[PDB]
Every structure is written in structure tokens, then in C-alpha cells.
Amino acid sequence: KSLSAAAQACVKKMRDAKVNEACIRTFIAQHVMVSKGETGSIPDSAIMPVDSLDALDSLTIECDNAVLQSTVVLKLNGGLGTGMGLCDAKTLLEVKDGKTFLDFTALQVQYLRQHCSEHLRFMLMDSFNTSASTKSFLKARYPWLYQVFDSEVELMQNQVPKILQDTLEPAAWAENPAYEWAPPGHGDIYTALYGSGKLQELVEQGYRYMFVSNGDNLGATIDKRVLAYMEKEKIDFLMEVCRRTESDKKGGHLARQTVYVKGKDGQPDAEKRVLLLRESAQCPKADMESFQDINKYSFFNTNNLWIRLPVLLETMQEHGGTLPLPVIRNEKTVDSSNSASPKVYQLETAMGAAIAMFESASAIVVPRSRFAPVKTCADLLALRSDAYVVTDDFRLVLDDRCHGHPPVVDLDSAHYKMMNGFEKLVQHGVPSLVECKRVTVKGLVQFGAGNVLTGTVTIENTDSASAFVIPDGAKLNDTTASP
Numbered sequence: 001k002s003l004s005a006a007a008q009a010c011v012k013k014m015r016d017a018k019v020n021e022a023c024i025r026t027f028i029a030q031h032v033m034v035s036k037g038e039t040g041s042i043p044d045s046a047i048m049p050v051d052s053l054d055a056l057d058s059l060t061i062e063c064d065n066a067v068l069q070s071t072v073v074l075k076l077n078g079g080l081g082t083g084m085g086l087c088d089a090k091t092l093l094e095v096k097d098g099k100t101f102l103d104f105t106a107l108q109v110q111y112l113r114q115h116c117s118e119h120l121r122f123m124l125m126d127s128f129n130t131s132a133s134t135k136s137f138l139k140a141r142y143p144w145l146y147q148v149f150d151s152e153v154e155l156m157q158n159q160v161p162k163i164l165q166d167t168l169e170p171a172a173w174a175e176n177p178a179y180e181w182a183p184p185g186h187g188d189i190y191t192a193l194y195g196s197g198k199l200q201e202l203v204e205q206g207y208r209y210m211f212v213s214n215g216d217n218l219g220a221t222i223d224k225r226v227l228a229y230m231e232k233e234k235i236d237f238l239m240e241v242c243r244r245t246e247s248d249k250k251g252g253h254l255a256r257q258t259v260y261v262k263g264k265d266g267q268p269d270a271e272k273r274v275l276l277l278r279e280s281a282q283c284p285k286a287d288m289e290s291f292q293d294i295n296k297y298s299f300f301n302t303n304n305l306w307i308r309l310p311v312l313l314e315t316m317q318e319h320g321g322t323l324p325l326p327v328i329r330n331e332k333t334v335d336s337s338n339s340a341s342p343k344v345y346q347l348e349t350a351m352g353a354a355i356a357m358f359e360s361a362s363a364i365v366v367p368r369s370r371f372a373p374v375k376t377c378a379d380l381l382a383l384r385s386d387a388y389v390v391t392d393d394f395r396l397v398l399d400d401r402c403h404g405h406p407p408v409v410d411l412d413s414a415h416y417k418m419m420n421g422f423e424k425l426v427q428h429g430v431p432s433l434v435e436c437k438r439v440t441v442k443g444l445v446q447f448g449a450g451n452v453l454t455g456t457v458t459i460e461n462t463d464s465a466s467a468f469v470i471p472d473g474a475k476l477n478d479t480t481a482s483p
């Protein structure tokens with residue numbers, strides 16, 4: 001009511017689409033913020049760095065199994081993994097030995113149900129793109145999960161209209177009606193859990209803790225030392241972070257901020273703390289130096305989050321059924337391929353940003369073994385290789401002969417960024433990267449079946465007339481090999 005015609009059009013639009021009401025309430029709130037000209041900037045003058053945290057390696061103590069019976073595991077399955085040029089679900093790529101990401105997860109859940117807590121709950125966050133494939137995979141590979149897939153496993157992600165930069169109205173593309181919508185970031189999970197009523201369901205069913213992570217990350221597995229830690233320190237929201245390195249200067253960082261509880265009564269000294277998240281887009285042009293200074297801001301979000309659900313539900317109800325979160329303003333056109341299509345805004349939230357929205361919240365430093373996404377085919381190769389190994393609880397860990405360090409793989413992105421070409425590289429077989437510090441492939445190359453490599457291994461093809469084919473059983477140590 002009393003909303004600008006622009007907003008009113010969006011409501012009307014989403015109504016006809018039969019869009020969940022929790023999404024419309026949330027999105028309009030976000031639409032208003034933008035319309036009022038909220039910059040969304042997070043300057044250094046508004047924040048202080050975080051310098052000390054508990055480490056996961058230091059905790060020894062495991063929780064009892066009764067805890068795990070009220071735990072929910074939720075993976076994010078929205079991504080298409082187009083970065084490797086794949087038009088279906090990313091989690092469905094083979095990782096090791098005919099097993100996909102979705103395989104290792106399902107097998108890990110299986111372990112916990114049998115050997116620890118049978119009441120453990122598994123859920124998935126699917127986009128419209130990933131829903132069918134995910135269901136079809138489970139129907140063949142994991143019946144029990146499929147059986148309930150529709151009923152309590154699958155949580156569908158919402159879609160939100162792209163608004164015109166020019167009038168903030170819902171964009172209209174007659175060529176492709178589907179391009180009028182966009183996913184609202186992975187922070188939509190909260191809005192999805194509320195409107196679907198599945199938050200209310202779980203809590204009523206006596207489910208307290210939930211662990212959320214990215215599907216493409218095989219580092220993220222349940223660790224009972226984290227659950228015990230939360231119970232002991234009464235934490236409602238725990239964000240796993242790894243250390244920010246030279247490579248991570250582009251990535252966002254964990255920071256802290258101050259508000260005050262009402263009144264100045266008590267000892268007039270002690271302050272408050274809130275933990276927030278700052279993406280690069282939120283940082284102003286002037287503060288970009290410190291932002292990339294990893295000695296000041298030393299931690300980044302691994303997106304492995306443990307949440308206390310009843311508290312989470314309570315919090316949303318205080319704010320009228322939604323969870324306010326900082327809104328990234330995505331500047332695009334309605335059809336990304338068309339440069340001359342109408343310029344639009346896409347409003348997106350991050351799931352890690354909610355940390356600042358909880359009274360009892362914290363951040364724990366985990367080893368980078370717990371942050372292992374496969375963004376590229378180079379990363380995909382490492383896992384196929386014998387450098388890694390599958391455990392009896394179905395974890396993926398680095399073989400002991402690597403002595404803690406995983407083989408760096410450089411692939412020529414002209415040929416190998418695409419999974420298509422990449423498969424041709426490994427077509428005849430797979431090499432042994434366990435003893436290989438660094439491997440590099442330039443130009444067009446195809447591997448022999450059973451080869452092995454040690455130390456620095458460079459493979460260069462400048463000719464690029466056909467492909468340099470490695471002999472079977474060939475061995476390369478601290479060398480470059482061209483034809």
C-alpha cells in the first residue's frame with residue numbers, strides 16, 4: 001500500500017506468476033531500499049578488522065550422537081557450472097571413480113545415518129535448471145532420497161524480476177520471457193525456508209542445528225567438533241573461515257562493526273561487536289588498498305555455515321517474516337548477450353551476510369582443506385588423480401605422500417577451460433600427480449594412459465598441428481616436454 005507504481009507493478013507481476021508471498025515481501029523491501037538511493041557502501045570508517053579467532057584444529061571434543069539427530073545438512077545445488085562450459089548441474093560431474101559431488105554427499109549422509117544418527121536430515125537447494133537432473137539422478141542412484149525428494153528434500157530457489165535501471169519497473173523482453181527473471185543470490189535460502197514453511201516444519205520436528213555449504217565444495221563435511229563448540233559457547237550462527245592469502249585479495253573478508261544495546265547503564269566502557277561481511281562491490285574506490293591488505297583483514301567466508309534454527313526462525317518473525325540483508329546491485333542488461341538490450345538491476349543477497357543479524361554469532365578458522373571448490377577443470381583433474389584418495393567415511397583427503405600440499409595444475413584455458421576439450425586430454429587415461437609439485441600444459445596436448453610425473457612438469461605444444469601425444473608409461477621429472 002502507498003508503494004510507488006514501479007514497485008506496484010512488480011507486486012502485480014510476481015502475483016500473476018504465483019510467486020511465494022515471502023519472496024514478494026522481501027524483494028519489495030529491497031526494491032524500496034534501492035529506490036531511496038541506498039549506496040550500500042561499507043567504508044573502512046564504519047568497520048574495524050578482526051584479528052583473533054578460535055581455530056578448528058585446536059578443538060578436540062566431539063558432540064554426542066543425540067545432537068546429530070537434530071541436525072540438518074543442506075547443500076547448494078543451484079549452480080550450472082558454466083565456467084567449465086556445462087549446461088547442466090555442476091554437482092553431476094564425475095570427481096573420482098564414477099562418483100559425482102552428489103554421490104560423495106549422499107554416501108557421507110549414509111555413513112552418519114548408520115553409524116551415528118539415523119534421524120539426520122538431508123536437503124537440497126535446487127534452481128529450476130537443476131531440479132529435474134537432480135531428481136533423475138537420485139531416482140536411479142539413491143532411491144530412499146528420491147522417494148521423499150518432492151516431499152521434504154528439495155527446497156526450490158525463488159526467482160525475482162529484473163528491474164529497469166531507468167524507471168525501476170519490471171523489465172519486459174518479448175524475445176525471451178524467461179530472461180525477465182533472475183535468481184536472487186544464495187542468500188534467498190532464508191526467504192525460501194520461511195515461505196515454503198520448511199523452517200517452521202523442521203523446528204516443530206525438533207531440529208535445532210543446520211549445516212549449509214556449497215555443493216561443489218568437497219571440503220565441507222560434518223565435523224562433530226564444531227557442533228560441540230556451539231553448544232558450549234551458545235553460538236547461534238557460526239561462519240567457517242580460512243585465512244586470506246595473496247590469491248584471495250579479490251575475495252571478500254570478515255570484519256567487525258559496532259552498534260550498542262539500548263541505554264548506557266552499567267560500566268561505561270565495554271563496547272559491542274557484530275560480525276559482518278564485505279564484498280569488493282561494497283568497498284569504495286578509496287579503501288580498495290586496505291581491502292586487499294590481508295594483514296589487516298585476514299579472513300574470508302568459506303560459505304560453510306552452521307545455524308541454530310529456532311533462533312533463526314525467531315529472528316525473521318521479529319522483522320515481519322523476512323531477514324533484512326545488504327543488497328548487492330547487479331548492473332546488467334536484460335539479455336546478457338545483447339549489449340543493446342535494456343539496462344537492468346538485479347538485486348542479490350549473500351547468505352554469509354546474515355552473520356551480522358544474530359545476537360550469538362562467531363567465526364572459526366578452519367584449514368583450507370575444508371575449502372575445496374572445483375571451479376575449473378584443472379581443479380577437477382587433481383581429484384581424478386591419485387594425488388587424492390577416498391576414505392572409509394567417504395571423505396576426500398590428500399594422500400599422505402603429498403605431505404599436506406596438493407599438486408598445482410595449470411591448463412591451457414584455450415583448449416581445456418571447456419570440459420569438452422578437457423576430457424580429450426584425459427581421454428586415453430590419467431597420470432599420477434601425487435609426486436608433482438606443479439604441472440603445466442600449454443597448447444593442444446593429449447595424455448598417455450598410465451604415465452607418472454614428479455616435481456615441475458611442463459608440457460608445451462607451439463606447433464598445434466594435431467596434438468602432442470604422450471607415450472604410454474612415459475615419466476617426466478623436473479622438465480619441460482614439447483614435440
Ligand SMILES: O=c1ccn([C@H]2C[C@H](O)[C@@H](COP(=O)(O)CP(=O)(O)OP(=O)(O)O)O2)c(=O)[nH]1
Pocket residue numbers: 076077078079080081082083090125157183184185186187214215216
Ligand atoms: O544463487 C545461487 C548461487 C550459487 N549456488 C551454488 C552453486 C555454486 O557452486 C555455489 C556458489 O556459486 P556462485 O559463486 O554464486 C557462482 P554462480 O552461481 O554464478 O555459478 P554458475 O554461473 O551457476 O556456474 O553455490 C546456489 O545454489 N544458488
